[PDB]
Design a binder for these strands. Structure first.
Length: 90
DNA sequence: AAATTTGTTTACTC
DNA sequence: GAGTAAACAAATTT
């Protein structure tokens, strides 16, 4: 099922985070010191930061792509090293 | 020139 | 609106 109580960032039990894809991505982008990440770094962040997402990659990688291009507060910016995603706080 | 990842939509529940 | 699934197209690497 989903999270049994109020426990904080324990990523060590395969339990669904009680957060939207829209908001998890927003948090992953703002974690980077430059406030941007590549799509792969977002994939690495999700797996690293939650045990639940280590089991069915195709199910949620599709979701992450979907949310990025559906919400106006996610913006793609071309960099020297390639495409990255940023967040419009407004 | 594929192959494959990375971006956009659309639609269907709930 | 959120999560999921999918069809289809763009941009990017083998």
């Amino acid at each position: 099922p989903e999270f049994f109580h109020n426990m904080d960032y324990f990523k060590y039990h395969n339990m669904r985070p009680p957060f939207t894809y829209a908001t998890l991505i927003r948090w992953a982008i703002l974690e980077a010191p430059e406030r941007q990440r590549t799509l792969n770094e977002i994939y690495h962040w999700f797996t690293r930061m939650f045990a639940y997402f280590r089991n069915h990659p195709a199910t949620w990688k599709n979701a992450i792509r979907h949310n990025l291009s559906l919400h106006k507060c996610f913006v793609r910016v071309e960099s020297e090293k390639g495409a990255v995603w940023t967040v419009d706080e407004f």
